[PDB]
Amino acid sequence: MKRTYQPSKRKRKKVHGFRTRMSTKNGRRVLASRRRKGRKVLSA
Amino acid sequence: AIKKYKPTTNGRRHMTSSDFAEITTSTPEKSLLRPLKKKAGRNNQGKLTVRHHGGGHKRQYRVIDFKRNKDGIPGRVATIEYDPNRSANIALINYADGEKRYIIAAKGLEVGQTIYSGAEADIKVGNALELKDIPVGTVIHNIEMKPGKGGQLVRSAGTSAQVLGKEGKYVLIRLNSGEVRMILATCRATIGQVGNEQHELINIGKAGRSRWMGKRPTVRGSVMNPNDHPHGGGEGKAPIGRKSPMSPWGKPTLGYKTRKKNNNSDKFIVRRR
Amino acid sequence: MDARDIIKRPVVTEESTSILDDKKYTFEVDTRATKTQVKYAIEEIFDVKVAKVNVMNYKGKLKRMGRYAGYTNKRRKAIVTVTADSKEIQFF
RNA sequence: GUAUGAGUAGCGAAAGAAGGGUGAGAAUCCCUUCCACCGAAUAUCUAAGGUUUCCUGAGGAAGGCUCGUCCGCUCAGGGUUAGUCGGGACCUAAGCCGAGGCCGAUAGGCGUAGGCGAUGGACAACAGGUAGAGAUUCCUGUACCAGUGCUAAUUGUUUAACCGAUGGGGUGACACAGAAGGAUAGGGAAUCGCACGAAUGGAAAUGUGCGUCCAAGCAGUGAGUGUGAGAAGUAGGCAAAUCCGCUUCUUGCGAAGCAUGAGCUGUGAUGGGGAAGCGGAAGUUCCUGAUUUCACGCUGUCAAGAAAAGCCUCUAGGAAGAGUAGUACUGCCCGUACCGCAAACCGACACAGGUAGAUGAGGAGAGAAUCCUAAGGUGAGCGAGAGAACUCUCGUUAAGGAACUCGGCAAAAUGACCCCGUAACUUCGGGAGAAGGGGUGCUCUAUUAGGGUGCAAGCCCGAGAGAGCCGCAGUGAAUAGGCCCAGGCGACUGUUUAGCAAAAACACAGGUCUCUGCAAAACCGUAAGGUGACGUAUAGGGGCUGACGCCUGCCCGGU
RNA sequence: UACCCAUGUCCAGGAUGAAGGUAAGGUAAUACUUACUGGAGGUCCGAACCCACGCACGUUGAAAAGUGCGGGGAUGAGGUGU
Ligand SMILES: [Mg+2]
Ligand SMILES: [Mg+2]
Ligand SMILES: [Mg+2]
Ligand SMILES: [Mg+2]
Ligand SMILES: [Mg+2]
Ligand SMILES: [Mg+2]
Ligand SMILES: [Mg+2]
Ligand SMILES: [Mg+2]
Ligand SMILES: [Mg+2]
Ligand SMILES: [Mg+2]
Ligand SMILES: [Mg+2]
Ligand SMILES: [Mg+2]
Ligand SMILES: [Mg+2]
Ligand SMILES: [Mg+2]
Ligand SMILES: [Mg+2]
Ligand SMILES: [Mg+2]
Ligand SMILES: [Mg+2]
Ligand SMILES: [Mg+2]
Ligand SMILES: [Mg+2]
Ligand SMILES: [Mg+2]
Ligand SMILES: [Mg+2]
Ligand SMILES: [Mg+2]
Ligand SMILES: [Mg+2]
Ligand SMILES: [Mg+2]
Ligand SMILES: [Mg+2]
Ligand SMILES: [Mg+2]
Ligand SMILES: [Mg+2]
Ligand SMILES: [Mg+2]
Ligand SMILES: [Mg+2]
Ligand SMILES: [Mg+2]
Ligand SMILES: [Mg+2]
Ligand SMILES: [Mg+2]
Ligand SMILES: [Mg+2]
Ligand SMILES: [Mg+2]
Ligand SMILES: [Mg+2]
Ligand SMILES: [Mg+2]
Ligand SMILES: [Mg+2]
Ligand SMILES: [Mg+2]
Ligand SMILES: [Mg+2]
Ligand SMILES: [Mg+2]
Ligand SMILES: [Mg+2]
Ligand SMILES: [Mg+2]
Ligand SMILES: [Mg+2]
Ligand SMILES: [Mg+2]
Ligand SMILES: [Mg+2]
Ligand SMILES: [Mg+2]
Ligand SMILES: [Mg+2]
Ligand SMILES: [Mg+2]
Ligand SMILES: [Mg+2]
Ligand SMILES: [Mg+2]
Ligand SMILES: [Mg+2]
Ligand SMILES: [Mg+2]
Ligand SMILES: [Mg+2]
Ligand SMILES: [Mg+2]
Ligand SMILES: [Mg+2]
Ligand SMILES: [Mg+2]
Ligand SMILES: [Mg+2]
Ligand SMILES: [Mg+2]
Ligand SMILES: [Mg+2]
Ligand SMILES: [Mg+2]
Ligand SMILES: [Mg+2]
Ligand SMILES: [Mg+2]
Ligand SMILES: [Mg+2]
Ligand SMILES: [Mg+2]
Ligand SMILES: [Mg+2]
Ligand SMILES: [Mg+2]
Ligand SMILES: [Mg+2]
Ligand SMILES: [Mg+2]
Ligand SMILES: [Mg+2]
Ligand SMILES: [Mg+2]
Ligand SMILES: [Mg+2]
Ligand SMILES: [Mg+2]
């Protein structure tokens, strides 16, 4: 059994990172809504 | 020639190949090589637009001279080589300048001959001339369609076209497919037939040999599901239960003509194949 | 850059005191100071002749006091060795 | 929130025993001895990932499938050192972003110059010490790379030493398979050294145990592997070139000369390490020998096998300072603890699962198979005692030998090496390990006959035979094809429903019909822009049939 | 997880003996025969590695698909990392 989550630092920050969010209109929408709800960690 | 293989195994039983007797050297000219990367039919967007491609031996591009616009310099044939990117072989020509370039190997082109291009060239196999200076009846190849652009019409191995007449600003050519066409008189061509005639006699023999050249398997439409192909479905084997056989996207596939009906070059085509 | 603000404080422990007689001195420095700023700062402050500097970066440990989990501060430690013909530093 | 099932199921692959110690308390913690397990791993490194789990002093509420004085748990202090190792200040691939630009109700999509981006290219350090925790980093000894200043001679100064491109050129720079070599690592014997020299019949020597060395750099050498030499002349190498390319002449070669090149010798060594009793003796000769290196070197084949920087050279250019020798000094940022076939990673768990790479010893052996072991590591986080039914995993069974059953399902049987022998049919390759049989142990002739190695000493390899000897049994253990006759389907190797179906289904090489003259047809997209293709009818797309052999008949009214 | 692109890496041992080549024959010259050489293959047997054909167990599992004993491929239409 090879499971579903195989971790990697680079593969995580390149897909879900802050710069990846800020590079798109919809990623900026995601960041805005997470700021609105009041979450401690944005993106990451 | 064509080399038959002994039936040692079941995959070598029906297999044939060329013996590469005409090829002279096995190393390319380094300063004329460019890299190629496979695309497997993937689009600008990354989508698979043309299917059944991808995953063969890697190759490297050899930049060929189709314009043949070096006029008045005698060019001497140096070697005859192998090109993975086309069915015909190629010949390396180094001029009296010191410059070198590749051209398509014509039939009967041997090492040591001299090759000319221009207006004062003789009518011999390998020379390049404008179509107005070529006498009626000769067999030519590498016909270009717009002046200064480069050869484009007859170029694969064993193919040939024949000059057929004059109409002032145009020249009649009978293309390899059997078509009679009008081409400007200032467009160039090369005298002779194209090199490797036996290329069509090769029996591949193996499925892996098709895989080596970059061909993925072809699934028939009759063994698909109804949402995949207009032919899929049915219990057991099923006939073509339609009015006509169909392509994977509709649009009948047997006998249906797909050339544009309002084409701008219908006045330059004298008679179709 | 105002040498007294890139050298923070001496490190006093058994590990540091053991090498203290080798003319090796352990200090706390800014997290941004480089190996050469430290050397010139030491030469400006203590009036010595520095031979080498080694630096290392420490992470912050994770402590708690019940429902309150947090991280200790971030450290940058420098070991400074002086040349043979130079006066020492006290620490005491 | 609390019951019933109920003191019930379970306590997650495995060998432990006793004697001392600690403690309020011991099967479970520490020490000693014996026993047992892995050993192409359950050993040693090292990426990813984890993120303090590392070390020391205290602790026993909760966690640990039991106990605990213990712990990867709780508390408090500590612990990670680089010019040379891996990554930046060096280079580029796939891909991504993209000034102007093209396209588009808005939003935006595409894309040129340019730039990011290793899984690849280039690049200067080795051997020991380190008793709580780091080591090519600290320390000791000996080095190398780039640069700077200070001294001392040398040379050159605008018919101009010297430097030299963001430009040209060469190299860098490359697939797969096969075979024969050189060398070294490793392994094994003698020799040499130190110690022991003995409990139960024998042995003071043909006895027993352990060891039997050492870098980078510097100076030499070198198995080899590639390899034309000189001189003229220039429609080309965006300008120029003394460099490259092209042509013509002279001179001829497994001979030298040039490049590379494993390894070896001296120094480094007045140093370091090393068996026993803080010191430290000996470190020679021979045999075997790589999956490593020379080296993608050679040969062969077709499916025809990255880019840029770096390095060298050429001019365009810059030029009054320049190298030389000796000395001292300068060299930034990030990672460095610990686990890493695992109790620290992915699986909710201290989970019988999954996890890239380097090294990976001996006997017998073709072998990384197989059994037993070395270095090294472990005894598996519930026990003891009885030896019922039944269930699971194993071992033997008299006579019969498929009578069982949907069906020889399961099990039993064959199994290594050497020799003899072998059918129908065939697409002439096969069928074929067809079938069916025979021989294997130990002693003597015997350091054989003969081979490999060496100058010799010697060492290694080991067929035939004869005579014998012993067992129920001689590949005496483990590991190691059951075979034959006839038919259906598919030609064959391959692929398929992750988790009920592996097949007669899909694919395939081959056949045929049809579309396409190049801004090709076909396909993605509103378009721009693309694939097709850096291709050109011997090419590209679609439908059906599916190796090979013999063949493929009649109907054009309907669609 | 499916297909693709760029760049790396892995596959103990043993068996068979295609093309071609050399020599001796045989010819007017060839064809052809015999020995030696040679090292082909979606070749053969078989570990690592990949897979999942049969049976048994498990089935409030050690495991939300596994284990044990046999089984198929193992130089390629191969396995695998980033
Ligand atoms: Mg197709
Ligand atoms: Mg098909
Ligand atoms: Mg179907
Ligand atoms: Mg439909
Ligand atoms: Mg249908
Ligand atoms: Mg059907
Ligand atoms: Mg039917
Ligand atoms: Mg550091
Ligand atoms: Mg009960
Ligand atoms: Mg019980
Ligand atoms: Mg247990
Ligand atoms: Mg005890
Ligand atoms: Mg054992
Ligand atoms: Mg084993
Ligand atoms: Mg890490
Ligand atoms: Mg974790
Ligand atoms: Mg903690
Ligand atoms: Mg600990
Ligand atoms: Mg307790
Ligand atoms: Mg407890
Ligand atoms: Mg702890
Ligand atoms: Mg150092
Ligand atoms: Mg570095
Ligand atoms: Mg580096
Ligand atoms: Mg713009
Ligand atoms: Mg873009
Ligand atoms: Mg670019
Ligand atoms: Mg980069
Ligand atoms: Mg890298
Ligand atoms: Mg280096
Ligand atoms: Mg440690
Ligand atoms: Mg060390
Ligand atoms: Mg190349
Ligand atoms: Mg006695
Ligand atoms: Mg040396
Ligand atoms: Mg080669
Ligand atoms: Mg470890
Ligand atoms: Mg766990
Ligand atoms: Mg446990
Ligand atoms: Mg586990
Ligand atoms: Mg052996
Ligand atoms: Mg072994
Ligand atoms: Mg041991
Ligand atoms: Mg126990
Ligand atoms: Mg019986
Ligand atoms: Mg019996
Ligand atoms: Mg019987
Ligand atoms: Mg019977
Ligand atoms: Mg019955
Ligand atoms: Mg029946
Ligand atoms: Mg059976
Ligand atoms: Mg003899
Ligand atoms: Mg046996
Ligand atoms: Mg067996
Ligand atoms: Mg089949
Ligand atoms: Mg299934
Ligand atoms: Mg187009
Ligand atoms: Mg278009
Ligand atoms: Mg295109
Ligand atoms: Mg034809
Ligand atoms: Mg057929
Ligand atoms: Mg069919
Ligand atoms: Mg046929
Ligand atoms: Mg018919
Ligand atoms: Mg009709
Ligand atoms: Mg009609
Ligand atoms: Mg690829
Ligand atoms: Mg095979
Ligand atoms: Mg087979
Ligand atoms: Mg599968
Ligand atoms: Mg197997
Ligand atoms: Mg096999």
Short mmCIF file of C-alpha atoms (C1' of nucleotides) in Angstrom, two decimals, chain D residues 273-551:
data_model
loop_
_atom_site.label_atom_id
_atom_site.label_comp_id
_atom_site.label_asym_id
_atom_site.label_seq_id
_atom_site.Cartn_x
_atom_site.Cartn_y
_atom_site.Cartn_z
"C1'" G D 273 47.94 3.89 13.93
"C1'" G D 274 48.68 -1.07 16.03
"C1'" A D 275 48.50 -7.56 19.69
"C1'" A D 276 49.40 -8.45 24.54
"C1'" G D 277 50.83 -6.54 29.18
"C1'" C D 278 50.39 3.55 30.32
"C1'" G D 279 53.30 1.64 26.60
"C1'" G D 280 53.90 -0.65 22.30
"C1'" A D 281 57.06 -5.92 18.77
"C1'" A D 282 56.39 -7.69 13.30
"C1'" G D 283 54.23 -5.45 8.91
"C1'" U D 284 57.73 -9.82 4.25
"C1'" U D 285 56.70 -13.72 -0.20
"C1'" C D 286 53.11 -16.16 -3.06
"C1'" C D 287 48.08 -17.36 -5.03
"C1'" U D 288 43.25 -15.73 -6.52
"C1'" G D 289 40.86 -11.54 -8.32
"C1'" A D 290 36.43 -7.91 -9.35
"C1'" U D 291 29.65 -6.00 -10.27
"C1'" U D 292 35.41 -0.90 -9.65
"C1'" U D 293 38.88 2.07 -13.00
"C1'" C D 294 41.50 2.78 -17.89
"C1'" A D 295 36.54 3.49 -20.73
"C1'" C D 296 31.45 4.41 -24.49
"C1'" G D 297 38.36 2.89 -25.26
"C1'" C D 298 37.34 -0.99 -29.22
"C1'" U D 299 34.06 -3.73 -32.35
"C1'" G D 300 29.07 -4.28 -34.24
"C1'" U D 301 23.87 -2.62 -35.02
"C1'" C D 302 19.78 0.58 -36.34
"C1'" A D 303 15.68 2.60 -33.62
"C1'" A D 304 20.63 7.19 -35.51
"C1'" G D 305 21.57 8.71 -29.78
"C1'" A D 306 20.38 17.41 -24.98
"C1'" A D 307 21.70 22.73 -24.22
"C1'" A D 308 24.55 26.62 -22.26
"C1'" A D 309 28.52 28.07 -19.42
"C1'" G D 310 33.56 26.86 -18.63
"C1'" C D 311 38.59 26.08 -21.13
"C1'" C D 312 41.78 27.32 -25.72
"C1'" U D 313 42.46 30.28 -29.85
"C1'" C D 314 41.38 34.78 -33.56
"C1'" U D 315 40.95 39.47 -34.49
"C1'" A D 316 37.78 44.11 -33.23
"C1'" G D 317 39.35 46.86 -29.31
"C1'" G D 318 42.21 48.99 -24.28
"C1'" A D 319 46.85 50.48 -23.68
"C1'" A D 320 52.04 52.83 -19.57
"C1'" G D 321 52.64 50.10 -16.99
"C1'" A D 322 53.49 44.95 -16.72
"C1'" G D 323 54.54 40.10 -15.29
"C1'" U D 324 58.80 37.34 -12.14
"C1'" A D 325 60.69 35.73 -7.19
"C1'" G D 326 60.26 35.98 -1.94
"C1'" U D 327 57.00 37.24 2.19
"C1'" A D 328 52.73 38.43 5.15
"C1'" C D 329 47.54 38.92 4.94
"C1'" U D 330 42.07 38.43 2.87
"C1'" G D 331 38.05 34.73 1.35
"C1'" C D 332 30.57 36.14 2.07
"C1'" C D 333 25.35 33.73 2.80
"C1'" C D 334 22.29 28.94 3.65
"C1'" G D 335 22.49 23.28 5.73
"C1'" U D 336 25.23 20.70 9.47
"C1'" A D 337 21.93 17.96 16.24
"C1'" C D 338 18.93 12.95 15.93
"C1'" C D 339 15.69 8.89 13.16
"C1'" G D 340 16.22 7.40 8.20
"C1'" C D 341 13.27 -0.95 5.59
"C1'" A D 342 11.82 2.87 10.69
"C1'" A D 343 8.64 2.91 17.72
"C1'" A D 344 11.12 9.47 15.13
"C1'" C D 345 8.85 9.14 7.29
"C1'" C D 346 3.37 7.86 4.40
"C1'" G D 347 -0.65 4.57 6.62
"C1'" A D 348 -6.01 7.75 12.86
"C1'" C D 349 -2.02 3.39 16.60
"C1'" A D 350 5.05 2.27 19.70
"C1'" C D 351 0.26 -0.81 13.06
"C1'" A D 352 2.90 -8.41 10.08
"C1'" G D 353 1.84 -2.88 4.55
"C1'" G D 354 4.87 1.09 1.28
"C1'" U D 355 9.90 4.00 0.97
"C1'" A D 356 15.26 6.31 -4.14
"C1'" G D 357 20.75 5.39 -4.02
"C1'" A D 358 26.35 3.76 -2.47
"C1'" U D 359 29.05 -0.50 0.26
"C1'" G D 360 27.45 -5.64 1.07
"C1'" A D 361 32.75 -10.85 3.94
"C1'" G D 362 33.94 -16.82 4.57
"C1'" G D 363 33.02 -22.60 3.66
"C1'" A D 364 30.66 -25.57 -0.26
"C1'" G D 365 28.81 -23.20 -5.05
"C1'" A D 366 28.01 -20.96 -11.88
"C1'" G D 367 25.70 -17.45 -8.60
"C1'" A D 368 23.58 -11.42 -4.81
"C1'" A D 369 20.45 -19.08 -5.20
"C1'" U D 370 20.83 -22.54 -0.62
"C1'" C D 371 22.33 -24.02 4.54
"C1'" C D 372 25.82 -22.62 8.57
"C1'" U D 373 28.75 -18.43 10.13
"C1'" A D 374 32.44 -13.31 10.33
"C1'" A D 375 32.37 -7.67 11.32
"C1'" G D 376 28.18 -5.67 13.24
"C1'" G D 377 23.32 -5.86 15.31
"C1'" U D 378 19.29 -8.24 18.13
"C1'" G D 379 16.19 -11.68 22.13
"C1'" A D 380 10.52 -8.13 19.59
"C1'" G D 381 6.53 -4.16 26.01
"C1'" C D 382 1.81 -9.37 29.21
"C1'" G D 383 3.21 -13.83 31.95
"C1'" A D 384 3.09 -19.66 34.40
"C1'" G D 385 0.95 -24.41 34.06
"C1'" A D 386 -2.02 -28.03 32.34
"C1'" G D 387 -1.17 -30.99 27.90
"C1'" A D 388 -9.59 -31.88 27.25
"C1'" A D 389 -13.31 -31.34 22.76
"C1'" C D 390 -12.95 -28.16 18.50
"C1'" U D 391 -10.30 -24.64 14.91
"C1'" C D 392 -5.57 -23.30 12.42
"C1'" U D 393 -0.22 -24.46 10.66
"C1'" C D 394 2.86 -29.03 10.35
"C1'" G D 395 4.90 -34.80 10.52
"C1'" U D 396 4.04 -40.05 9.78
"C1'" U D 397 0.48 -44.01 8.35
"C1'" A D 398 -1.28 -51.06 7.27
"C1'" A D 399 -4.16 -53.05 2.30
"C1'" G D 400 -6.14 -50.53 -1.93
"C1'" G D 401 -4.77 -46.40 -5.33
"C1'" A D 402 -9.33 -41.39 -8.06
"C1'" A D 403 -13.49 -45.79 -5.91
"C1'" C D 404 -13.72 -38.64 -3.72
"C1'" U D 405 -15.64 -34.64 -6.47
"C1'" C D 406 -18.97 -30.03 -10.60
"C1'" G D 407 -13.66 -30.79 -11.63
"C1'" G D 408 -7.17 -35.17 -9.40
"C1'" C D 409 -9.31 -28.64 -6.04
"C1'" A D 410 -5.46 -29.77 -2.25
"C1'" A D 411 -1.49 -32.80 -1.39
"C1'" A D 412 2.02 -36.49 -3.16
"C1'" A D 413 5.49 -37.19 -7.15
"C1'" U D 414 10.00 -35.05 -10.88
"C1'" G D 415 14.08 -31.60 -9.64
"C1'" A D 416 21.72 -30.67 -9.50
"C1'" C D 417 26.02 -31.99 -12.63
"C1'" C D 418 28.09 -35.64 -16.55
"C1'" C D 419 27.08 -39.36 -20.48
"C1'" C D 420 23.75 -42.25 -24.04
"C1'" G D 421 19.45 -41.61 -26.74
"C1'" U D 422 15.06 -39.16 -28.79
"C1'" A D 423 8.70 -39.60 -32.51
"C1'" A D 424 4.44 -37.39 -35.44
"C1'" C D 425 4.34 -32.80 -37.64
"C1'" U D 426 6.97 -28.32 -39.57
"C1'" U D 427 6.51 -21.77 -41.59
"C1'" C D 428 12.90 -25.95 -41.92
"C1'" G D 429 14.22 -21.95 -37.11
"C1'" G D 430 11.83 -25.83 -34.38
"C1'" G D 431 9.05 -29.67 -31.65
"C1'" A D 432 13.40 -30.73 -27.39
"C1'" G D 433 15.32 -30.51 -20.97
"C1'" A D 434 10.46 -34.68 -26.21
"C1'" A D 435 10.12 -39.53 -24.49
"C1'" G D 436 13.35 -43.35 -22.03
"C1'" G D 437 17.81 -44.69 -19.47
"C1'" G D 438 22.95 -44.92 -16.89
"C1'" G D 439 26.91 -42.63 -13.37
"C1'" U D 440 27.96 -39.67 -8.47
"C1'" G D 441 30.64 -41.48 -1.42
"C1'" C D 442 35.69 -42.52 0.85
"C1'" U D 443 41.17 -44.72 0.43
"C1'" C D 444 45.69 -45.93 -2.50
"C1'" U D 445 48.60 -45.67 -7.28
"C1'" A D 446 49.21 -39.71 -6.81
"C1'" U D 447 52.51 -32.70 -5.11
"C1'" U D 448 49.06 -38.00 -11.93
"C1'" A D 449 48.64 -37.05 -17.36
"C1'" G D 450 48.39 -32.28 -18.28
"C1'" G D 451 47.46 -26.87 -17.68
"C1'" G D 452 47.72 -21.17 -15.16
"C1'" U D 453 51.57 -18.31 -12.63
"C1'" G D 454 57.43 -17.46 -11.55
"C1'" C D 455 64.07 -16.50 -13.31
"C1'" A D 456 63.85 -20.46 -9.53
"C1'" A D 457 61.84 -21.54 -5.05
"C1'" G D 458 57.11 -22.68 -4.88
"C1'" C D 459 51.47 -21.79 -5.24
"C1'" C D 460 46.80 -22.76 -7.77
"C1'" C D 461 43.72 -25.75 -11.25
"C1'" G D 462 42.38 -31.65 -11.55
"C1'" A D 463 40.18 -35.78 -16.67
"C1'" G D 464 40.44 -40.57 -17.52
"C1'" A D 465 41.42 -45.08 -15.35
"C1'" G D 466 42.66 -49.25 -12.39
"C1'" A D 467 42.61 -51.87 -7.54
"C1'" G D 468 39.99 -51.71 -2.96
"C1'" C D 469 36.43 -50.07 1.69
"C1'" C D 470 31.68 -48.91 4.16
"C1'" G D 471 26.28 -48.20 4.64
"C1'" C D 472 19.09 -49.59 3.97
"C1'" A D 473 20.55 -45.31 1.34
"C1'" G D 474 26.75 -41.62 -1.72
"C1'" U D 475 23.77 -34.12 -5.77
"C1'" G D 476 23.12 -39.05 1.84
"C1'" A D 477 20.96 -31.89 4.70
"C1'" A D 478 18.61 -27.01 2.21
"C1'" U D 479 17.74 -25.07 -2.60
"C1'" A D 480 16.73 -26.92 -8.22
"C1'" G D 481 11.14 -29.32 -14.69
"C1'" G D 482 6.20 -34.30 -13.62
"C1'" C D 483 5.23 -36.24 -18.50
"C1'" C D 484 2.27 -38.00 -22.83
"C1'" C D 485 -2.26 -38.40 -26.56
"C1'" A D 486 -6.43 -35.55 -28.92
"C1'" G D 487 -9.79 -31.32 -29.76
"C1'" G D 488 -12.06 -25.75 -29.42
"C1'" C D 489 -10.37 -20.22 -29.38
"C1'" G D 490 -6.66 -16.62 -30.09
"C1'" A D 491 -1.16 -16.50 -34.74
"C1'" C D 492 3.01 -15.06 -31.42
"C1'" U D 493 5.71 -11.32 -26.94
"C1'" G D 494 2.42 -7.69 -24.68
"C1'" U D 495 -2.45 -4.92 -22.22
"C1'" U D 496 -7.20 -4.96 -19.16
"C1'" U D 497 -12.17 -3.93 -14.90
"C1'" A D 498 -6.72 0.06 -7.95
"C1'" G D 499 -10.71 -3.39 -4.14
"C1'" C D 500 -15.22 -10.30 -7.42
"C1'" A D 501 -14.12 -11.30 -13.97
"C1'" A D 502 -6.61 -11.78 -16.74
"C1'" A D 503 -10.09 -14.30 -20.66
"C1'" A D 504 -11.88 -16.73 -26.51
"C1'" A D 505 -11.79 -9.57 -24.63
"C1'" C D 506 -8.04 -5.05 -26.22
"C1'" A D 507 -3.32 -4.29 -28.85
"C1'" C D 508 -0.17 -5.98 -32.69
"C1'" A D 509 2.87 -6.75 -37.38
"C1'" G D 510 -0.02 -7.40 -42.22
"C1'" G D 511 -4.60 -6.34 -45.72
"C1'" U D 512 -8.12 -3.01 -47.87
"C1'" C D 513 -11.46 1.36 -48.60
"C1'" U D 514 -11.51 6.56 -48.31
"C1'" C D 515 -9.92 11.96 -47.46
"C1'" U D 516 -5.71 15.43 -48.12
"C1'" G D 517 -1.41 19.77 -53.48
"C1'" C D 518 0.36 22.51 -48.29
"C1'" A D 519 -1.94 28.76 -44.71
"C1'" A D 520 -2.93 20.19 -46.54
"C1'" A D 521 -6.99 17.52 -44.52
"C1'" A D 522 -8.08 16.41 -39.20
"C1'" C D 523 -8.10 18.30 -34.20
"C1'" C D 524 -7.99 22.39 -29.48
"C1'" G D 525 -9.54 27.52 -29.02
"C1'" U D 526 -14.60 33.13 -29.39
"C1'" A D 527 -10.12 34.88 -31.78
"C1'" A D 528 -4.96 35.44 -31.74
"C1'" G D 529 -2.00 31.08 -31.30
"C1'" G D 530 -0.91 25.94 -31.96
"C1'" U D 531 -0.55 20.21 -32.82
"C1'" G D 532 -0.28 17.75 -37.61
"C1'" A D 533 5.42 19.13 -38.88
"C1'" C D 534 10.67 22.27 -38.16
"C1'" G D 535 6.88 16.93 -42.23
"C1'" U D 536 5.23 17.18 -48.20
"C1'" A D 537 1.23 11.68 -51.46
"C1'" U D 538 7.07 5.85 -50.53
"C1'" A D 539 3.61 11.66 -46.36
"C1'" G D 540 -0.39 12.65 -42.90
"C1'" G D 541 -5.95 11.72 -40.80
"C1'" G D 542 -10.30 8.38 -40.44
"C1'" G D 543 -13.49 3.37 -40.94
"C1'" C D 544 -13.27 -1.94 -40.96
"C1'" U D 545 -10.27 -6.81 -40.85
"C1'" G D 546 -6.20 -8.81 -37.94
"C1'" A D 547 0.65 -13.40 -38.55
"C1'" C D 548 0.92 -17.04 -42.41
"C1'" G D 549 -1.54 -20.54 -46.52
"C1'" C D 550 -5.86 -21.23 -50.26
"C1'" C D 551 -9.70 -17.98 -51.39
#
